[PDB]
Symmetry: D2
């Protein structure tokens, strides 16, 4: 399948933010996805000195959100039920600082108004990306501000860009871990729009629709990637005894209850493309965001079935958009 991108051995010892004169770089990745979703903008910035970065989804009007912080090792700030931005970043818990840069910028744009109903709400989540490089540089307040300032409608930089700079997969053993990236995908169906954004830094591996392992757990001794379960099961036989952060953004009106269950459904669906997933070693966090523009019909019928047009249906479609995004990240 694809050529290996082995991350290589941990190097710990390296310089931190203050050691450098750090210039934000607008991330372009390997290619740009273009899409049509008015009211949603995306910016991505990185420090070459990491390499590490942040990716910001800006919805200036604000949008209702559900968070499904399903992993065992989550790094989350805010996790609000209504957001003006979502900030995804490297740097482990230190990278939550990037969201502060976004928040301050939005406060300035609001002319420092502070009424309850005009608080600018930014939710942030992070990946641990320090094993995939040899510095301690992290996404700081300045980098989050830059990613917001770089945000534009209808573009997403695929691959090694923003939060995906140093994302990696397949962590049974660090000698077999491979660099991933970030990914996005978009579908429009009638008036319905669905955007998926993902930064897969899994303990598990990326798996395609045929069941092929396409990124992570690559053994240079064999030239082949293995599903982790094969390693795990042999490890048990031998010895006993002897994070992915993501967002799904849509324009379909969903109640708080529908939106929450939609988040759970889409998030669980990602165990198709990332295996294992939702593990104690992962901090998997999905944000489900709706711009509340399009009604679903009051009854769920169509020529395709009596129960074919509802939030579960939307969840199933969004799950496919998200798998496409995961595969873009691993490409």
């Amino acid at each position: 399948d694809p050529a290996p991108r082995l991350a290589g051995p941990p190097v710990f010892g390296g310089p931190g933010n203050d050691a450098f004169d750090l210039a934000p770089v607008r991330s372009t990745g390997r290619e740009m996805l273009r899409f049509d979703f008015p009211g949603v903008s995306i910016g991505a910035a990185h420090y070459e000195e990491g390499p590490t970065g942040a990716t910001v989804i800006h919805i200036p009007a604000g949008a209702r959100t559900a968070v499904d912080a399903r992993g065992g090792a989550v790094g989350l700030s805010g996790g609000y039920d209504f957001n003006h931005a979502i900030c995804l970043a490297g740097g482990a818990g230190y990278g939550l600082e990037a969201g502060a840069g976004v928040s301050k910028a939005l406060l300035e744009r609001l002319e420092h108004r502070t009424g309850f109903a005009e608080l600018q709400l930014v939710s942030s989540a992070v990946i641990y990306d320090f094993s995939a490089r040899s510095t301690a540089v992290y996404p700081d307040k300045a980098l989050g501000r830059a990613a917001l300032e770089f945000a534009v409608p209808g573009e997403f930089p695929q691959g090694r860009a923003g939060a995906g700079m140093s994302a990696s997969a397949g962590k049974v053993d660090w000698d077999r871990t491979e660099i991933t990236g970030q990914g996005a995908a978009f579908r429009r169906l009638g008036d319905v729009r669905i955007l998926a954004v993902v930064v897969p830094n899994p303990v598990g591996v990326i798996v395609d629709r045929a069941g092929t392992v396409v990124r992570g757990n690559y053994d240079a001794q064999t030239g082949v990637r293995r599903h982790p379960v094969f390693d795990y099961q042999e490890a048990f036989a031998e010895q006993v005894p002897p994070t992915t952060i993501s967002a799904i953004v849509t324009n379909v009106r969903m109640s708080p209850v529908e939106l929450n269950q939609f988040a759970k459904q889409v998030h669980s669906s990602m165990h198709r493309g990332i295996q294992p997933f939702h593990t104690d070693m992962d901090g998997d966090t999905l944000f489900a965001v709706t711009t509340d523009e399009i009604d679903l019909p009051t009854t769920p019928g169509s020529s395709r079935g009596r129960l074919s047009v509802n939030a579960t249906a939307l969840g199933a479609i969004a799950s496919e958009v998200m798998w496409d995004a995961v595969l873009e990240a691993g490409k």
Copy 2:
């Protein structure tokens, strides 16, 4: 692939429990799985008049449990963190009564002692199985008692047995829904034992490791099963605008936190074999149970990797046992 088992059109109008002289039947299914797991017994009973039934996992010593009630339409009783039995049943919420039959029987065996530390704890979960038949008979207290009385070590009746009598899959449209069953699978690795039991009554369909839809959403007009997303996406393009209950039982000691995250991981993994899953229309509930007999090593290394022997590893292995069980249920 497999021959269709279409459930056929809803028939509502039918007789309930009191209309019959109801005799419990010991369920044998299509075949018996045999396995070696001392301290775990399984019983299954049904009423032919439904057809509907209950399946009971009895662990007389009691075992630590985590519950992951992830679906939007859950029918759960007890949901305790320590159980002497798990009762899975048809009959929608009415079938929770079967667990009372189990509980009373266990109280009688305890000679009606009622100290806090000898309370007999039964957690129960249910599927809605009324659309797959033409009666209102449900698993009652007598049926739960019978399933417990029928419990034996090391046997599980596959297929149309116990709670699986009238389980069905693929509910975009009732004309395409197919009867499933219940299923189990077992693996032993070194001293580690993992038993998976499942009663798939999903809105979604059963999918095999190649990605083939093997049960549910069968169209008699074409002779072919479809993944629901194909129906959903065309329904949206047209109109906008114009439950699985399961248990994983193991003998590996896990702390409450490990056991809870293990439950979440294994449950999410089932979105590989059941698609969609964890939907608002489903009451998906997984019980993760440990008999707390075997330690994992204090450090997680083996020849297969530095991070290869831990609870996440066990979760990945258990996820495969569960997929095997789902495929047995759909066979």
Copy 3:
């Protein structure tokens, strides 16, 4: 005058079970009947004298949106649905969840055994452990839940030793100081806003009045008075470490699922005023907040008494007082 003691006495933790008796449900009348005006809500309470133990059922045939706040560490809950035709509160620990099955079956029969989704009859049940307060193993069974439903009437509630409250008790630092409580209810109408509180306090803690006086539980027969448990706990630590309550709040005010859920949490927390300690590992405290969705609040929350005075929080504060009154009726 301090209330007279109602010590439960020393627990044996067992005795004869249900089938040792020819169990006839008794309609519970308690010590007094509360009467109130809330069409669409009926309450029935039944007991077995042979326990003594019982069940109390709230029946809302329209069905009503519900939030559950299962806050305690030792909860016994069935269903816990976000929409219910009945709530069943019972003794008998986990065994007493069976009473709810009796309610469910009876409701299925009233529905002529129809089983379409819209027709499924939804009963949520919660239990207290009441076996220390008596010397039998009798529990609320399917027949007792059915009886409690059949006895249900609008506008009445039997206070005291009635239904689920038959063998409820408080103050469990030591069983020698535990006292029988009861069940309790209170009701307020503000114009057409209606709030009903029902409670079955079986706390590890004690019942406390609005002055901060301990009024039920932790009665020391050697002193003739009730102290707050914390006095015992702090003395215990100095010595040895040297150097359930089930409840419902029912209202007719429309609240969204989000509002109703937070209203449940607020009202439930408020009960740590009248029950102390509360929400402990030893307790299975469960509150059901139910709205019959009859009355909207104004779109904006202002009044002469303030800019933020008419909203679900406000309703929660009022409901919290109704619930404290119900707790005090249970302890009376």
Copy 4:
């Protein structure tokens, strides 16, 4: 004598922001210093006079197991980790979560920028909305969190208008009746058992003493007294419907994750005694329960004061009293 009023005054909801000022952190001293003996725990409090607003940091360099009970409807939380090297409490609403980033960065520097898993420095942060209580938009920023950490010392806590409590306020039925609170702490030692409570009450509700008297918040300048909010709420309903608190409890007693989580819930609920209403939709109430894992309780829970007297519930009841004392210090 009833306490003198400390009305916050009418809110403008905006003003100059951080960069309009040359902001120098000030070490907060408050009205009084609490002194106590708990090695391994340091507290620092810093403010900007230009807000006025501040941050209070609890630093536990060993790291400590933590349970978070984010019970309010309007929570502002970062991290919420089950193991923490620091807890940062701040004003500035969601913007003030930035102070925790300053703590985290400073701790990374102390660790010589090591980034192995075992070395990750974990800071959980929570905030109050304190913008109604002043006419600026200044918030606790990265520099202020750093300063609060640098000012942290063992065995001291500045009571009153200090750190996160600079512009905390209570009683928000109407802003004309809202009063400045402060932050508060209390400490108890029972032998070698140690319990520290820290609280920053910014409630929608009011502070209530052990007699049931409202002592801070909802002061009506037309009457000269404070009433419980429920009086306003019930009058508001009759008229118009005609027919955050952030806190930490730190102990040295070993509790398992399950015990510690239920202990957090218990102690948090107990605060509805001293803050009423509490846990409302309008509030972002968040409690951190932290154990330094130094002392085991006995294996069995007996003492002369009862068979169930020495356990995590008992500790929770004692800790609940320490926390009420801290709330009253904040309101004093």
